[PDB]
Amino acid sequence: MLDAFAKVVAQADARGEFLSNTQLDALANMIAEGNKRLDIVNRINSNASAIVSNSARALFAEQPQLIQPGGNAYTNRRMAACLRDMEIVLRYVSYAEIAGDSSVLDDRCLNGLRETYQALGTPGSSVAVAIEKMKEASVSDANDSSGTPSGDCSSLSAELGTYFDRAASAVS
Amino acid sequence: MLDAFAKVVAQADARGEFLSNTQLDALANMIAEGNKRLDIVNRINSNASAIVSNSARALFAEQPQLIQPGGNAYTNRRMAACLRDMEIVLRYVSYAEIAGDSSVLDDRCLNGLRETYQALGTPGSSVAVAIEKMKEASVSDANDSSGTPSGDCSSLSAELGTYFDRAASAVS
Amino acid sequence: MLDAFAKVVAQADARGEFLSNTQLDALANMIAEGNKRLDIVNRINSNASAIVSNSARALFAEQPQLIQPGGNAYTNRRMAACLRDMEIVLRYVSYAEIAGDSSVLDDRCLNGLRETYQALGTPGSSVAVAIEKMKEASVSDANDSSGTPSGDCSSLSAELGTYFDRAASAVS
Amino acid sequence: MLDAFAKVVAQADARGEFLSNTQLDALANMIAEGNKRLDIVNRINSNASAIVSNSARALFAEQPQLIQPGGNAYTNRRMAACLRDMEIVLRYVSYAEIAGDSSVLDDRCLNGLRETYQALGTPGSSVAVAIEKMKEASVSDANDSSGTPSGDCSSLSAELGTYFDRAASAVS
Amino acid sequence: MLDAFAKVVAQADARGEFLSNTQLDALANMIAEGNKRLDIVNRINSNASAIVSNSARALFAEQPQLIQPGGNAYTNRRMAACLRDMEIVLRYVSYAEIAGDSSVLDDRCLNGLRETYQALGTPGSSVAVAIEKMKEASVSDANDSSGTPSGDCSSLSAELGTYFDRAASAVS
Amino acid sequence: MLDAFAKVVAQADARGEFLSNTQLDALANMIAEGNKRLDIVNRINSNASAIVSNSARALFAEQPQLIQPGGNAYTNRRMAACLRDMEIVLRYVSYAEIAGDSSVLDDRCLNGLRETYQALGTPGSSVAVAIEKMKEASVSDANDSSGTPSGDCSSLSAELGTYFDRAASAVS
Amino acid sequence: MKTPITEAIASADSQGRFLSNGELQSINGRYQRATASLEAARSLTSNAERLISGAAQSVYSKFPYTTQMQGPNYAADATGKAKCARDIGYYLRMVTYCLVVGATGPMDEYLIAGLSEINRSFELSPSWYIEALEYIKDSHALSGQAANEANTYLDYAINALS
Amino acid sequence: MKTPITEAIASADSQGRFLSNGELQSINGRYQRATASLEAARSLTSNAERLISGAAQSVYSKFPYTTQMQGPNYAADATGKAKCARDIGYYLRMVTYCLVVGATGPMDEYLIAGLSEINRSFELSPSWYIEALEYIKDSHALSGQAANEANTYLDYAINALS
Amino acid sequence: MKTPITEAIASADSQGRFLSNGELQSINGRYQRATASLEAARSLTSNAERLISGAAQSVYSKFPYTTQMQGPNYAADATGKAKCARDIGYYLRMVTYCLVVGATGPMDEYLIAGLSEINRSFELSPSWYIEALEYIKDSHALSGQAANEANTYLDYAINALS
Amino acid sequence: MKTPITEAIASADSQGRFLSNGELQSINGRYQRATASLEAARSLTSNAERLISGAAQSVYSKFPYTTQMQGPNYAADATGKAKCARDIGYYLRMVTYCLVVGATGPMDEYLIAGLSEINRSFELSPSWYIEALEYIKDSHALSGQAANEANTYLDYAINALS
Amino acid sequence: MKTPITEAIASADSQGRFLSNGELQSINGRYQRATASLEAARSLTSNAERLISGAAQSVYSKFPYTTQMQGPNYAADATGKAKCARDIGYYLRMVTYCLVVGATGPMDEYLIAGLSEINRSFELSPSWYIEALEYIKDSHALSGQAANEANTYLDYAINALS
Amino acid sequence: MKTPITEAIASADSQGRFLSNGELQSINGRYQRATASLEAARSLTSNAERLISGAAQSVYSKFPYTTQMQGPNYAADATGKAKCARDIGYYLRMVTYCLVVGATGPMDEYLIAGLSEINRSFELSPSWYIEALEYIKDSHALSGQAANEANTYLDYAINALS
Numbered sequence A, B, C, D, E, F: 001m002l003d004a005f006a007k008v009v010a011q012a013d014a015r016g017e018f019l020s021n022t023q024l025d026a027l028a029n030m031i032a033e034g035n036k037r038l039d040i041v042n043r044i045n046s047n048a049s050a051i052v053s054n055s056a057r058a059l060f061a062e063q064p065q066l067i068q069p070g071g072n073a074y075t076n077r078r079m080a081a082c083l084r085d086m087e088i089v090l091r092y093v094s095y096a097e098i099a100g101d102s103s104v105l106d107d108r109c110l111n112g113l114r115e116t117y118q119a120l121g122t123p124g125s126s127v128a129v130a131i132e133k134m135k136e137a138s139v140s141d142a143n144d145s146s147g148t149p150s151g152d153c154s155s156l157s158a159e160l161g162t163y164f165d166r167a168a169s170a171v172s
Numbered sequence G, H, I, J, K, L: 001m002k003t004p005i006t007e008a009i010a011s012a013d014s015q016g017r018f019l020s021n022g023e024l025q026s027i028n029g030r031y032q033r034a035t036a037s038l039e040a041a042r043s044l045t046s047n048a049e050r051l052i053s054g055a056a057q058s059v060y061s062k063f064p065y066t067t068q069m070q071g072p073n074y075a076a077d078a079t080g081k082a083k084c085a086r087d088i089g090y091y092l093r094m095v096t097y098c099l100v101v102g103a104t105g106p107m108d109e110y111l112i113a114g115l116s117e118i119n120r121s122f123e124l125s126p127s128w129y130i131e132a133l134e135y136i137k138d139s140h141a142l143s144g145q146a147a148n149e150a151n152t153y154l155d156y157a158i159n160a161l162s
């Protein structure tokens, strides 16, 4: 997998080039935004159980057919797997956020997921709703200044939103 | 795998329903037919090597080209594989018979077998004939009342015949 | 795997026949040629590193683009895999040569290789150039009489070149 | 492993003998006690969690030093191991009870336990106390006639007490 | 393991020395003894089943107590293990013979054997008798000119005898 | 395993206590020397092959018997195992150094080493000499202010020496 | 699904062999016990509604805080009380499935697998269910071996929760 | 040794758990069938020497050569014939052991393990034994389920031989 | 115990190599964050009694029934409430150890391993502890990064419980 | 198929290397022995009919019952005797193949793999074949190393049968 | 590619969990060291041609035999010396990549994996590259932690070569 | 140590069987080749001193630096040159061992295993040894197959160095 730094390096190596002063400057900027990126990831890790369970609770309340007998989330084994998938997506998004690159998300997690759900009979549009709820809960936590020095994190929050969106598209 | 009891339960859980009166009746009937079903399985078990070998003997007398040099059952390794397959089908049919359900036979034995024989160059029509000879031998033992209180086993013998038939259709 | 002797045997067995006096005569001739065949393999073995390295050096001198950054043989890991691939082909060819049958080269080495290279993005034509250079170097070693009783080995050297060609055609 | 029947058979085989009519009578008598032996084992299984948990609770109420910082049952991992060891002994005792022979208990569970605990720093007399409490709970369950035809199970309840006692002494 | 040549090289290496002309002459005599050494091993290989079975038959005829119930060789499992141990010993003796050194016999087979039998309850002295019977059958075959150019194999057959004696002494 | 911080926490836990302010300040003294401890570890990593090789060279100049034929470091496999051991000790000393605790070194490396070398016949006093040469080289590197802000590291260099000494005493 | 019959079959298959007498004898042990099991299953099913409703009340009376502490995971709301009765019915239905197949298989697969994860995540207390299961044991009205069968599976569930 | 009880215990232990109701039902199964099994074991035991004698004679009648081929593996000699009756007695004794414990365990352990190796090494024809076994089946004169139990284990041995 | 330092060492060792500069920077990362962590550890520790007492009261006010339902499992008694405050203090103490070593290691090993089994066996509700931890987070009165540190580990515990 | 050459290759390949001098030597050994082998192979092939017929007759004489006993399993009938002669010819033809490739591979592959299962399932006695192989050894009339080669492989078959 | 960040992630993923505080801490250590890392990277890059030139010449002066003895594998020729400066330039560029990502990942992946095979096959002496790298350490003129960063990765390459 | 004979044994043993004709045949290949092998070994040994001395000189001329260049590893002293003649003598002595056992085993075990580690750590150039081996090949003056045997092992060492 690649983080944002490794990605610039891999692109540079294939051309046999040293990074440019301009590229080095863009990486310094990312280093400067590091504490803030770490706050965002810490907010996700610190609220992981809530982000997942509250979003699932909301999904099953909006889509009760998922949990009735014969629904894809009926029986505790299936309910457990559904909560697990939501947690997996949230973990991979959080990995993408600390890496500042969607690679780990795309390769270890989203690649083929759409096919997997179609084969299982898991409704992908419902999984996307689950992911959109986790995104909303997360972006809301990321935008909350309680616990951090006040400042602008709009770039980072927007970036976090793009990762959740990549996940929501891939499952459908 | 599922036995006849688990299959009814699986159909009821998918509907989120307690078993119906007709379901509970059918299950009571399976229990009542139990000793008889056991007698049939014991006949196969007690006559397994004869059922296999006498059937293979008849198969090769009818189709000598299987054992001619170059034939699919020529060399002891291939003859042993052939006899093994017959014993395997007989084993799984006996499992489906004690189970009262073909799931074990279908999934652990029949699934993909037609493709396997085509890929090997094993003539499927011949495998089917070997299977039909075992069924004939087994149904005949099943109709022999020596060793059992005399009574009616016609539904059980027909069900046994059905499992052998599923196996014979699956190989070509 | 089959050597030349085992091949005639497998063909005779499928026909249920004993080898004819003529086949027996043809195999005795192969036995007569054994020492010369062993000399060829020993020449390849004793010069393997130089055959492989001098051929790669020649290939990279002609196709510098392969080792430039971005090229398929750029980075030591890829250059090492390229050298290993050349050594693998040289090995299977030597095996074919002492087996006196291409079956081993075909089965364990050339089969599916054209595809493997296409997927990796490794230029089949370059691999073929590499093989052709190794063929050239080995055939030259084979026609060198220093260290062997002077004699005619034309048949075997032509057989050796055939194995290399099989490899050169299989990679692209 | 041996149950009471296999034990007699193994002794008879080493002497090259068939069981005597007296031995057959003794096994028949054991067969007659089967439903009662099954009821006792069902009672343990059905109350396993309470038997273990209440017994540990009593032990820690008596020996509070076990759970305070530094004690052997302090931290959840050690408490979990302690509870687990109690269920293991109860499990093995239940095994000996259905087998009607202390063999599996003495072999797979008691032999060496004394050293293990001495090595670990686990107070043996404390473990013997836990076992003694599970014994009281279990024998009391076994003597309870609610849920069973009323009858005499004193020899079975005596046998049950004997297996537990073997465990209590095997640990210190 | 070591064969006779490697053992001489190993000792020379530890002294950092080239083999002397006398050592080289000793090894050349070994090469001269080669065909005869190959005939001895072939005789054992060609008569292995008879050497083992006939030897076992004689041991059981003089020591019937081994096979009566309770005897160490009673039950087919134990008889099979006893035959297996004779074959293993014969097999290792034949390796020592082809190697011209007892190292593979001592390391892979005899070291620890006496302990094993003691712990097992297997009477080592009976195992030695079984071995002495195989040695006598084997030496007898090796001194039989039927099928070999008539000549002197006294040195080799005396060496074969030494390997059997080593095995016989190692089991008690 | 434990680093210095974890060691204080484990002692505290077993006593059921929070760390005192004194303990917290003592750990803050460890944090304050952290950059220096890192420099020492970096010096060792950055000079590892020289520390090992130059030390081994001096050991073999002082003790040529180790490399003469028959010696414990004679043949390249043994010479290489010897260099690997020096490197393994050096790695474990550097781990103890970053941990600020000898646990990892005593547990995963030194425990049982004395017995291992005695069983192998490796002269332990020669290994201790090797380890003392690596200590001398490492401490000389550590006292070298080239590449670091100038300051006093005598306390850390003494601690580093203690780890090396623990290893040297353990091998004999 | 694991039942006495599929288990005998899995054992023979894992050894590439036909079932033998011991196995047929084990299965007949199941058929023999089955008359008491089916009697229990017919009764729990005919009495499902009274048992479930009866069990839910028992829980609300024993943990009156769940009928009051209002939030998403409590009997505070109509939805919560309906979910509670729905869950209890799940447990009763699973016990009838186990009776029918002669094993815990149905409960293990449809309910117990993932149970710890679910109760933890939605903050459902095992104690609530234990109380409902105790009520069922106390209220079914079966006797003899049919009661033994029912209680054995209800106790298996209690054990899974503690 | 494999019996229905040791087997249930071995499975529960392998899964670190108490015996399941499935296993208690299997053992119930063994207790239920044991009256017929012990009845068969008592009668075969009582008639052993008669059964062994008739069986050996049946073998010699069917395979005339074995009694007239003076060699180690032949009924030709006194030793050969003594061993033949001895072997037949072993199959019969193993059969009673199987009846006693309720499984094929005893015969698997004491006779079938290594059986192919022995018959191959000593050139004993499995066919000779199958004949002795069929004679026993035809001669024990049991009836009902006691006959079913005996015949089942006797057929188990014939199948191991073919 | 897993700390950033022992962890870096176990990884280097599992690869038979010297620590990497990446691992040195990682340890430097822990050395840099330690000032904030040690300050949180000192503060929570000096306020330990009032945090623990206040957390227990907060659980008693939110789960009235625990101090009401009289049995071994509830703090309906002096022993019961004593164990509750003792458990609450264990959580706090673990949190300070995590701060001290810069990782969840101490809490993972001394408290979280086996937590599920103990809460299930003794019927302790994870929700009770979640409320105690929420209380501590709202009450420690830390600020800046010392507060972030404290809260990150208190939230980690909350997550282990839900 | 396993020959001295495919074996050397398989070894070299398994270790990812070129054959080494030791294997060239091994292969040289096969070329050296081949003259004796091919002479044996030619002679056995030339006298195959004679040999197969005399072998079969030797078996009928030693085991009279097989040419006497009714059943497909016996060379009593024409078909049984034709199968027998056919089988004996299979052993002879495999022996010639071993001589040709210089190893037991053809016999291992085409006949020994699965031999125990066939002989047991069809109740063929290993002893009948051993007798035919002994007859062939005594009647091929080869001398010197050609006889050594032929007998070695015939003895190898005898060993697989016992 | 292994960096402090991807390693933190790979580790957490291998355990199916979110990164913990220990890991965030390690990543902040990377970010805190990055300032010196990037300064070293910018400087080595702007001076690359001077360093590569100076390193190539230090090699020819020390092993003049390379520029002496000829063939394809030497500093004797144009392509040889061209390839030498090119290789040196590769070492330097990998060094700046290691500096930019905070770990030896780029150098491990792009240069060290397969290095001994290449040096052996093309008979390139590792001693040549060690002289070049020592020259660069002696000539980059960085100071403070920027120098330490640069030298650590330069020393990592020398160790891979020795 | 791997020899054609120990290798045959290992394979037989790896299959729990006696050696078969194929393998005896293989060992016969080693016995037939041995006369040329021992002729080569005897000659290389009687000429060891002048071959070794000549080989060292040959290396000193091709690589003049090592005769000048100061340093322990370079023969810029009496010791360095004594170690050089010493190593060359080891390669020659290992060559004679291979010739004696008929395989590369001695060389593989005493010299090649660990060779890359040693040459890298002590900065010894594999090219220096190739030069010495080429010189021995060009100077032993053997002829016929004995020369073939000698060069095959000398080229095997050359291949191990490149």
Ligand SMILES: *[C@@H](C)[C@H]1/C(=C/c2[nH]c(/C=C3N=C(/C=C4\NC(=O)C(CC)=C4C)C(C)=C\3CCC(=O)O)c(CCC(=O)O)c2C)NC(=O)[C@@H]1C
Binding pocket: D032, D033, D034, D035, D036, D037, D038, D039, D040, D042, D142, D143, D144, D145, D146, D148, D149, D150, D151, D152, D153, D156, G033, G144, G145, G148, H021, H024, H025, H028
């Ligand atoms: C002492 C142990 C208690 C006691 C028991 C006792 N039980 C019975 C009889 C039966 N118990 C069962 C129970 C089982 N058999 C099985 O199949 C299984 C599960 C698969 C179990 C748990 C049964 C079937 C019976 C027979 C019932 C019937 O109605 O026929 C008795 C009665 C006498 C007997 O020996 O059969 C007794 C005495 N009784 C006590 O008072 C103790 C408290």
